[PDB]
Amino acid sequence: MEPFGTDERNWTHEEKDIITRFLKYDKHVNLKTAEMVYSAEVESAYFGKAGALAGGVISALFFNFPIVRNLPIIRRSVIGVLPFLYCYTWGKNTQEELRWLKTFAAYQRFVVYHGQHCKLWV
Amino acid sequence: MILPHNNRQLARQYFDSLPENDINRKYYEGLKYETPKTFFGRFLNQFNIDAKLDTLSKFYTYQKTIRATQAELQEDRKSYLTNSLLFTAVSWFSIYQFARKGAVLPVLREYGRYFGTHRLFRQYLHTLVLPLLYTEYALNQKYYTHMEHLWTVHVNRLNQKILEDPLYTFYPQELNVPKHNIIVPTIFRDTPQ
Amino acid sequence: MDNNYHFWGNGDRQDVSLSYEDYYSILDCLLDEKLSPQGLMKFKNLHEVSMYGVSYVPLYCFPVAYGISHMLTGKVRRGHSGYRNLFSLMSVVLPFTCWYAYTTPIPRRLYTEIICSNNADGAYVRNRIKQQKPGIWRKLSQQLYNKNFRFPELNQDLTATEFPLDYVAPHKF
Amino acid sequence: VYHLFERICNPDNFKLSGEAARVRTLIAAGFSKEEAEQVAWLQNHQVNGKILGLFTGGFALYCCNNYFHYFERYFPRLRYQPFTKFLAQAATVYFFFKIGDYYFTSRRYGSNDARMNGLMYSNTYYSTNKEALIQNFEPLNRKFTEEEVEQFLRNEGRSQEEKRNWIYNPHIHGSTEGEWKADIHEKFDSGKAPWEREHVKAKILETNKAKIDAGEEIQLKPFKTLNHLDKTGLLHRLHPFIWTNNWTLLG
Amino acid sequence: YKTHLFSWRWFLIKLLPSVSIILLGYYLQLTLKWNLFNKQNTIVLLITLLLLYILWLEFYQFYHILSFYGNINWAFDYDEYIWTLELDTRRTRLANNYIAICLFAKFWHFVFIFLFWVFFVLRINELGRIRYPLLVANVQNFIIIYIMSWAYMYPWLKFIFRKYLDVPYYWFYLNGRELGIRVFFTDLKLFFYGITNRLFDFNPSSIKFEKYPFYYWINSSQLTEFNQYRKFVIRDSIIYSLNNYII
Amino acid sequence: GFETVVPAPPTRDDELRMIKATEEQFLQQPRYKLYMNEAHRIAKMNHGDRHNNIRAHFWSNFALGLLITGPIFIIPFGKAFRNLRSGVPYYFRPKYVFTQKNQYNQDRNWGAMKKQIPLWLGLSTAYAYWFTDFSINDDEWLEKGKVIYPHQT
Amino acid sequence: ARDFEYNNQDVNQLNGAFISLVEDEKIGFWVGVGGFAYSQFIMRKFVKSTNIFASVTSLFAGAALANLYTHQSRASYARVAARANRNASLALNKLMEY
Amino acid sequence: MIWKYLQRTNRGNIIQAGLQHRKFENLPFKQNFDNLTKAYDLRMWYISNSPHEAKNLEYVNELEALHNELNYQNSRQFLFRTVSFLLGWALFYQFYELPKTYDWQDTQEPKHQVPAYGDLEEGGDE
Numbered sequence A: 001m002e003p004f005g006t007d008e009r010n011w012t013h014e015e016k017d018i019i020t021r022f023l024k025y026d027k028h029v030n031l032k033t034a035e036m037v038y039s040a041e042v043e044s045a046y047f048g049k050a051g052a053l054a055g056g057v058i059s060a061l062f063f064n065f066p067i068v069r070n071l072p073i074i075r076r077s078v079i080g081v082l083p084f085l086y087c088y089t090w091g092k093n094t095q096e097e098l099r100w101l102k103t104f105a106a107y108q109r110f111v112v113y114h115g116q117h118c119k120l121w122v
Numbered sequence B: 001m002i003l004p005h006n007n008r009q010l011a012r013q014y015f016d017s018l019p020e021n022d023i024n025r026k027y028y029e030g031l032k033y034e035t036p037k038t039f040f041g042r043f044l045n046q047f048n049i050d051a052k053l054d055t056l057s058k059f060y061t062y063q064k065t066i067r068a069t070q071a072e073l074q075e076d077r078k079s080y081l082t083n084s085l086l087f088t089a090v091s092w093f094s095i096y097q098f099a100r101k102g103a104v105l106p107v108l109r110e111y112g113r114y115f116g117t118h119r120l121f122r123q124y125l126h127t128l129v130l131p132l133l134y135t136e137y138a139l140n141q142k143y144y145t146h147m148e149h150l151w152t153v154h155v156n157r158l159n160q161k162i163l164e165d166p167l168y169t170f171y172p173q174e175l176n177v178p179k180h181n182i183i184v185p186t187i188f189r190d191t192p193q
Numbered sequence C: 001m002d003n004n005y006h007f008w009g010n011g012d013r014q015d016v017s018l019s020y021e022d023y024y025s026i027l028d029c030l031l032d033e034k035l036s037p038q039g040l041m042k043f044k045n046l047h048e049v050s051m052y053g054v055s056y057v058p059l060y061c062f063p064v065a066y067g068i069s070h071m072l073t074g075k076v077r078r079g080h081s082g083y084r085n086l087f088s089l090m091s092v093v094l095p096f097t098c099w100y101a102y103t104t105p106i107p108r109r110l111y112t113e114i115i116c117s118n119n120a121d122g123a124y125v126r127n128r129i130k131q132q133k134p135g136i137w138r139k140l141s142q143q144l145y146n147k148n149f150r151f152p153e154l155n156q157d158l159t160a161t162e163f164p165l166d167y168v169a170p171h172k173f
Numbered sequence D: 001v002y003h004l005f006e007r008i009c010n011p012d013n014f015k016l017s018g019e020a021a022r023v024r025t026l027i028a029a030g031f032s033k034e035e036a037e038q039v040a041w042l043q044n045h046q047v048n049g050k051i052l053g054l055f056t057g058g059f060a061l062y063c064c065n066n067y068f069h070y071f072e073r074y075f076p077r078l079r080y081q082p083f084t085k086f087l088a089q090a091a092t093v094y095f096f097f098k099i100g101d102y103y104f105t106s107r108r109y110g111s112n113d114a115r116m117n118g119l120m121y122s123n124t125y126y127s128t129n130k131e132a133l134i135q136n137f138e139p140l141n142r143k144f145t146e147e148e149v150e151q152f153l154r155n156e157g158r159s160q161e162e163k164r165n166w167i168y169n170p171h172i173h174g175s176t177e178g179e180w181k182a183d184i185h186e187k188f189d190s191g192k193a194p195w196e197r198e199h200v201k202a203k204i205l206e207t208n209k210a211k212i213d214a215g216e217e218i219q220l221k222p223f224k225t226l227n228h229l230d231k232t233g234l235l236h237r238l239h240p241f242i243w244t245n246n247w248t249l250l251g
Numbered sequence E: 001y002k003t004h005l006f007s008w009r010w011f012l013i014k015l016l017p018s019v020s021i022i023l024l025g026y027y028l029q030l031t032l033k034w035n036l037f038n039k040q041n042t043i044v045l046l047i048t049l050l051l052l053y054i055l056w057l058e059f060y061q062f063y064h065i066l067s068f069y070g071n072i073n074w075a076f077d078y079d080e081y082i083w084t085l086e087l088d089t090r091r092t093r094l095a096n097n098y099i100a101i102c103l104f105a106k107f108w109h110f111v112f113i114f115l116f117w118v119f120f121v122l123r124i125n126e127l128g129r130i131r132y133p134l135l136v137a138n139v140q141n142f143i144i145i146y147i148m149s150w151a152y153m154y155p156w157l158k159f160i161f162r163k164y165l166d167v168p169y170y171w172f173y174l175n176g177r178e179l180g181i182r183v184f185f186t187d188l189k190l191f192f193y194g195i196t197n198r199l200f201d202f203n204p205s206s207i208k209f210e211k212y213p214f215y216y217w218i219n220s221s222q223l224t225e226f227n228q229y230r231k232f233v234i235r236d237s238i239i240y241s242l243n244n245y246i247i
Numbered sequence F: 001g002f003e004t005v006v007p008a009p010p011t012r013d014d015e016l017r018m019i020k021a022t023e024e025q026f027l028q029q030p031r032y033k034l035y036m037n038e039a040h041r042i043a044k045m046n047h048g049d050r051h052n053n054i055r056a057h058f059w060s061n062f063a064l065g066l067l068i069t070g071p072i073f074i075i076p077f078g079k080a081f082r083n084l085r086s087g088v089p090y091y092f093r094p095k096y097v098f099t100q101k102n103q104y105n106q107d108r109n110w111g112a113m114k115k116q117i118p119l120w121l122g123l124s125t126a127y128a129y130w131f132t133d134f135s136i137n138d139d140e141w142l143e144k145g146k147v148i149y150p151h152q153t
Numbered sequence G: 001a002r003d004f005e006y007n008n009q010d011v012n013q014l015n016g017a018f019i020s021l022v023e024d025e026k027i028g029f030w031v032g033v034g035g036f037a038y039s040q041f042i043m044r045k046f047v048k049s050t051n052i053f054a055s056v057t058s059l060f061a062g063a064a065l066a067n068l069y070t071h072q073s074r075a076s077y078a079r080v081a082a083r084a085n086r087n088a089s090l091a092l093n094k095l096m097e098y
Numbered sequence H: 001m002i003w004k005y006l007q008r009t010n011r012g013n014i015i016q017a018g019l020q021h022r023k024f025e026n027l028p029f030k031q032n033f034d035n036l037t038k039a040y041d042l043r044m045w046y047i048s049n050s051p052h053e054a055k056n057l058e059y060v061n062e063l064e065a066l067h068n069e070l071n072y073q074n075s076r077q078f079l080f081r082t083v084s085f086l087l088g089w090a091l092f093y094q095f096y097e098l099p100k101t102y103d104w105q106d107t108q109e110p111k112h113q114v115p116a117y118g119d120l121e122e123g124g125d126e
């Protein structure tokens, strides 16, 4: 139901938020499609905080690591926080990817359900 | 897309509220607009982009293309302005830190020709002003042609006296007509044939 | 200036230039029922030329990719000895060269005829590309305007009473 | 440099140029394929004498350039004024140029006899075609009327190989079936030209009243060059040469 | 319309780790003449880490493909107001099934060469030096597995060579034209002009609106005519609703 | 488009004239040209004649291309094989067969030959396709497939 | 009122040739002016000749240089225009024949 | 005079080429790849065309060393260029916005995802 091609514009954050809300609370969607979106939210929220928590523990260890500990604070803090940043972004990136991929799959199911694809029919 | 009876003619309403002696009034009367073709004319017109966008926003508020243009231009202003400020802050920080250590970049004359201002002072002045001028120059070129085409369409509509809302206008909920969801299928009857 | 300017598959320097990727994208948003028999014939001829052209593009890019792969390996030409690293590294260099070639638009008499025709078929294709392929049309409209083509579908129309549906890139008035 | 190589090595350069150059230029000018051939022949014949004279004059100079030196005995001006000798040679070339022109361009009236027509003993073919063209050539001094322009557009699909089956639809033609058939037959079937219709002629006179008042005749029929030019001479009832033809004209 | 064309832009990035390994392997082979075992462990370890990375990617895709045939869905029983888990078989185009088997064979081959390499690294560590026979055999294994990685790229071959098959015989007199070689040389001229124009003549800008949501979902109107797919009336309704929500 | 007038069915005399016309066309058919009796026989034969005309022009250009491109491109291109990029004169660099090349300039002459001959043919065919005109047998709209019957001719 | 309509295919092909021809003419003229100036400079500096002879040679050298640059576009337009003129002439003659 | 240009061949097209002296007149003071390959070609050409056995055999020994040296030089060239290509390739895809808006019709099989034939597939029995 959207433009296709390399020259087109990739999905924006606002567009994704509107579509996922549309799938969740719109009447024209079917129950199975709505359940798919709901399952994606619950099953994806874990990674957002799991990655952050894992990063903090690793960063705390890395702050006291053999070399990081003896470095000056300016270098010690910056080097010691890198594992947290890598894990924090990894958790957020995987959460959004998991939620978006299943939400996009629900969007595909909705389009086929209402026959809004110009090259799909029974 | 909006049927004649469902059009609120907000552009006409704004036109009526405008003063007696207005440029838009003259365009409606038949005044024709031609974009400048000389370099001096284009340079002058470069500073009228903001005025044109504002009046078009007032005339055709809720118009898709105009509303999109405002959003993109506002975001670009914020994006360019913050980038310019960050560059100035970083450059100022770099100049001060190296100056403290005794290293000064050999750019610009050491002392001014008239007021004798030192090289460091002018480097700060150039760092503050040059990115701002580039930001203004960069933004204007990006939207100069886009603004002129929007202004040209607006003038053409006034000349034809088309004050109705254009295509791709989406009014708020208050001005949107409710949809009748009560449908009663006709009674079934066996065909005489 | 070859001796076959009549040939439909041929092209001129200033003819409308359309990429292979653009050509295949445009085919997605068109319906055959809405084209006149003459319009269908133009597309069928275009496929006939494109069928051979698409397959040849990697052939044209082969010498360029072959040379680049040699440079990457080093300044030693070892013949049969280096085929493994040459063709293993060339398996990614050649797709890159084809990427550049396919993204490169090329002029063709059929491209200008189909897009710039002043009949119902010409209007139909332009509007379909304008609506369902806004990304392609924006580039196409800029090219058409620069080549002195005037149509209501162009975003650079200065005599239109309706606002453009896409960003208008800078150009000389 | 790729184009420059193309220019130098184009095979057309090596191929001998034909006589179709005049025909193609005339076709581009506007003359029909048949009209272009007739006009091309008339131009070629007019220029052939001049070309033939130039070659004859040059050949005469090449073989007999020593005569000018020999004539110095009686005309020492040639010996003591080379500029005089050059002018004499130029005059000789012009002398052959005019003689060739006279043979191919002068009227040189001759009998219309099959036994010698076309032998170039008399310039009958060129003279008759030239006279007919000049006499009967009158530019169309009108503006094509709306009816004529409409008829020309309607003549896109007409063909004499098979007559068109005209079908009367009251909702798009109007009038009556009999009247419409009669008008259609006059317009297309009969072959009558658009300008020959009575109402078309009346409109032409009304629109060109200013020219008529000034005293200028209005030519209803545009000039048809193919109706006055015939290199074969059949149009002018010129008997074809006996030995190159297997038929006779009554005359 | 089911052409099954996978984007090359997406394919090349996936192909980077495999081509990286073979290049590193060759350098290890070439440099083995004048290098020691201890120094070259950096290359061996890098290859092993890369091979582990590819092994995980092969398994994760392999796990996904095999898990397809178990169709599991949630069914909502309205009478009991309970969601229940149900298992069912799969029906799909057989081309998907055939490639899945080919991808299964690819995984087992990669597991084989991985164990081959794991066997190789362990033995050289015990011996204390690397040898050409085993080292070269592993490098060629990497090349062979790299070739087999293009298994799922067959649709492009059909897309190219299926259009050659449908061409009828010349003398059956269906179109009476053969433009194979003529197109070959003509396209050289066209590409020469296309490249020169691209890098020396006017090039349309790629600027576009990046902020206004759903800007490029253009609903049908007078400007775009009404020759779209018939059932886009709903799409126009949804586009109209979205713009109202934005405004 | 418009439809032409359909003539009434031919009489016996008209049928005989058509039969005689077909007989003449069959006799005129060349003995060495093998075309099957079908509705498209005359159309195919006309297509074959146009193809032969293109075939003639193409090979004349190809022969001319070999004549011209040789001294202009191939022979100067063979000067690049005089020396290697390092400056040393050309010497044999075997791949797998250590051929004996005792004859004077055998290595250089053969090495250059392997590249010149493919280039010579490649340029000539490009010369042929560039300067040869296919307009005679090109039908963009495929309107020349109309069946022509022997009696119509 | 209706009027004769030219072939859209020919019109489009002419448009491409005309656009290229106009661009070449503008560029070719500057090349010719530059070529004349360069030839004049060379003649007056290295060649022993009269000014009139040098000026005439420079003018021909510039004109020849300009022609070489613009020959492709001029030749391309000439053949396309010639084909278009013949097609238009034949079509109009067929319509107006009587 | 056409024969003077077609049938007359340049002296270089027949006679064996000499040594490009300018290639050896001035050389860098670095024992780099360029000098090594120049030395390799000189000995290699001399071996092919020379009848002196004593000088050829010592050239072979020297040439074998040059082959090993050129392998070492190429190995560095292979490493640096290959690493640069891989890093540039990785960086290109890191900062390149990969199009994620391609058509997804291929992944959808409406007639297969929901079996159209329903119970008729199993036996029939009508």
Ligand SMILES: CCCCCCCCCCCCCCCCCC(=O)OC[C@H](COP(=O)([O-])OCC(O)COP(=O)([O-])OC[C@@H](COC(=O)CCCCCCCCCCCCCCCCC)OC(=O)CCCCCCCCCCCCCCCCC)OC(=O)CCCCCCCCCCCCCCCCC
Pocket (backbone or CB within 6 Å): B108, B109, B111, B112, B113, B114, B115, B116, B117, B118, B122, B125, B126, B129, B133
């Ligand atoms: C639109 C307005 C936007 C404003 C943006 C803000 C920045 C600019 C204005 C800032 C003002 C306040 C700054 C703080 C002041 C503090 C006081 C102080 O001590 O001074 C600080 C410091 C000077 O102190 P100093 O110790 O004496 O240092 C002197 C060193 O020589 C100086 O050396 P330097 O290290 O500074 O280097 C020289 C200077 C470069 O300056 C030059 O010398 C370049 C000159 C180029 C000339 C180009 C041809 C112009 C042709 C005629 C133009 C007519 C006007 C057209 C109007 C069009 C419509 C806009 O800089 C550079 O070379 C690097 C920068 C690259 C060039 C970019 C310049 C952009 C200027 C944009 C604003 C233009 C305003 C024009 C107003 C009207 C003028 C008539 O001030 C500056 O550096 C500001 C300079 C601003 C431009 C001056 C132009 C003078 C030449 C005018 C020629 C025409 C008229 C001549 C009349 C003659 C009498 C009859």
Ligand SMILES: CCCCCCCCCCCCCCCCCC(=O)OC[C@H](COP(=O)([O-])OCC(O)COP(=O)([O-])OC[C@@H](COC(=O)CCCCCCCCCCCCCCCCC)OC(=O)CCCCCCCCCCCCCCCCC)OC(=O)CCCCCCCCCCCCCCCCC
Pocket (backbone or CB within 6 Å): D109, D110, D111, D112, D113, D114, D115, D116, D118, D119, D120, D121, D122, D243
């Ligand atoms: C470049 C194009 C090429 C095209 C493609 C060609 C391809 C090749 C095909 C070649 C096929 C052969 C063509 C041959 C054509 C020849 C001409 C021709 O057909 O004329 C037919 C000629 C038709 O002439 P006509 O009736 O006066 O009609 C007028 C012409 O139609 C027309 O009259 P007109 O209006 O033009 O002129 C009116 C009047 C206006 O003109 C005059 O009155 C002129 C009067 C003076 C004569 C011409 C100047 C002579 C100058 C002096 C001599 C030469 C000086 C230089 C050398 C020194 C000489 C010593 O002219 C005449 O009176 C014409 C009289 C005919 C003779 C003069 C014709 C010119 C002769 C030039 C000769 C040199 C050229 C080469 C040889 C001939 C060509 C093969 O027919 C006859 O007269 C034959 C009738 C025979 C009846 C039966 C006879 C039975 C036998 C009885 C006598 C038996 C005697 C036994 C003797 C035994 C004693 C022991």
Ligand SMILES: CCCCCCCCCCCCCCCCCC(=O)OC[C@H](COP(=O)([O-])OCC(O)COP(=O)([O-])OC[C@@H](COC(=O)CCCCCCCCCCCCCCCCC)OC(=O)CCCCCCCCCCCCCCCCC)OC(=O)CCCCCCCCCCCCCCCCC
Pocket (backbone or CB within 6 Å): A067, A071, A079, E042, E045, E046, E049
């Ligand atoms: C920021 C602006 C933007 C720039 C953008 C571009 C660059 C961005 C880079 C981003 C990363 C920056 C991270 C900075 C960390 C600083 C930590 C710290 O406290 O430093 C203070 C200290 C301050 O220095 P300083 O006291 O002022 O100067 C005197 C030095 O302290 C005097 O001490 P030293 O000279 O004895 O140095 C100590 C030596 C101590 O080490 C040694 O004794 C030598 C050990 C053998 C090295 C063999 C090198 C050649 C072979 C490759 C490595 C072999 C292992 C295999 C790993 C790869 C394949 C799996 O370690 C090093 O410094 C270099 C170690 C080797 C390279 C780093 C990789 C570690 C590999 C070896 C560890 C084993 C790994 C097991 C397997 C890992 C599998 C994932 O900084 C350092 O010296 C540390 C330098 C660390 C390297 C950072 C530069 C990275 C970019 C260039 C090199 C790229 C190499 C890539 C190799 C892998 C290829 C696959």
Ligand SMILES: CCCCCCCCCCCCCCCCCC(=O)OC[C@H](COP(=O)([O-])OCC(O)COP(=O)([O-])OC[C@@H](COC(=O)CCCCCCCCCCCCCCCCC)OC(=O)CCCCCCCCCCCCCCCCC)OC(=O)CCCCCCCCCCCCCCCCC
Pocket (backbone or CB within 6 Å): C054, C055, C056, C058, C059, E160, E178, E179, E180, E181, E182, F054, F055, F058, F059, F117, F118, F121, F122, F125
């Ligand atoms: C290597 C050492 C160096 C020495 C050798 C040279 C280099 C190797 C190649 C040499 C052998 C080439 C093949 C034989 C051709 C000549 C045969 C012949 O003399 O008999 C007359 C025979 C018929 O001639 P004609 O009827 O007078 O045609 C000329 C008229 O102008 C009409 O012209 P037209 O444009 O209308 O085309 C006419 C032709 C047009 O034909 C076509 O339309 C077919 C071509 C379709 C396009 C290609 C599709 C397949 C490739 C797809 C690539 C996909 C890539 C992957 C993409 C995706 C993945 C990346 O159609 C026909 O007339 C019907 C017959 C078609 C037969 C085609 C098959 C020929 C090969 C098999 C028989 C001979 C044995 C060869 C053994 C193997 C050789 C390697 O000649 C032809 O085949 C047509 C002329 C071909 C051009 C001139 C060739 C001159 C010879 C030197 C060429 C140098 C190489 C550069 C050119 C590329 C090759 C053509």
Ligand SMILES: CCCCCCCCCCCCCCCCCC(=O)OC[C@H](COP(=O)([O-])OCC[N+](C)(C)C)OC(=O)CCCCCCCCCCCCCCCCC
Pocket (backbone or CB within 6 Å): D001, D002, D003, D004, D005, G031, G065, G068, G069, G070, G071, G072
């Ligand atoms: C003052 C200091 C003096 C120092 C000495 C050096 C001075 C050098 C001066 C260089 C001036 C260059 C002027 C270029 C003018 C181009 C004009 C033009 O448009 O022509 C286009 C034509 C080609 O036209 P075209 O039609 O193919 O295409 C032109 C381009 N388009 C397609 C865009 C229209 O090119 C020429 O033929 C130009 C050269 C003409 C002949 C004179 C050549 C003199 C030099 C010959 C050197 C040969 C060396 C040996 C080579 C051996 C090879 C194996």
Ligand SMILES: CCCCCCCCCCCCCCCCCC(=O)OC[C@H](COP(=O)([O-])OCC[N+](C)(C)C)OC(=O)CCCCCCCCCCCCCCCCC
Pocket (backbone or CB within 6 Å): E111, E112, E115, E116, E119, E131, E132, E133, E134, E135, E137
């Ligand atoms: C569920 C996942 C898969 C489960 C299945 C498990 C698969 C396990 C695969 C293990 C592979 C181990 C390969 C070791 C090769 C050792 C070769 C050797 O002896 O060295 C000779 C030598 C060793 O040389 P060197 O370098 O050690 O020393 C030579 C001696 N000097 C140095 C002194 C000169 O190698 C060579 O000659 C080089 C070529 C080797 C070619 C090896 C081919 C192996 C083919 C194996 C086929 C297996 C079929 C399995 C079928 C399915 C089973 C389930």
Ligand SMILES: COC1=C(OC)C(=O)C(C/C=C(/C)CC/C=C(\C)CC/C=C(\C)CC/C=C(\C)CC/C=C(\C)CC/C=C(\C)CC/C=C(/C)CCC=C(C)C)=C(C)C1=O
Pocket (backbone or CB within 6 Å): C001, D002, D003, D005, D006, E188, E189, E192, F069, F073, F076, F077, F079, F080, F082, F083, F119, F123, F126, F127, F130, H012, H017, H018, H019, H020, H021
């Ligand atoms: C649209 O444009 C066009 C096309 O499409 C692109 C066409 O296809 C075509 C089709 C037609 C064609 C003929 C194809 C044209 C193709 C072209 C021009 C490209 C191909 C060109 C070539 C193959 C020529 C390549 C050859 C060269 C550049 C010559 C190289 C010569 C060299 C290096 C000379 C070296 C020699 C020396 C240094 C001398 C050494 C001497 C010594 C004695 C040794 C030293 C010894 C001592 C002692 C010092 C046309 C016409 C066209 O215009």
Ligand SMILES: CCCCCCCCCCCCCCCCCC(=O)OC[C@H](COP(=O)(O)OCCN)OC(=O)CCCCCCCCCCCCCCCCC
Pocket (backbone or CB within 6 Å): D054, D055, D057, D058, D059, D061, D062, D065, D086, D089, D090, D093
């Ligand atoms: C325009 C105004 C300005 C002033 C010019 C006025 C021109 C007037 C008209 C043309 C005048 C032509 C005569 C010119 C002067 C005399 C030329 C001359 O000498 O011609 C005779 C010459 C004899 O040859 P000769 O060299 O004596 O050899 C003796 C061998 N024992 O033989 C020749 O050399 C041949 C002379 C032929 C003259 C022209 C004949 C017409 C056909 C020409 C065809 C094309 C010739 C091209 C020649 C190219 C030469 C590079």
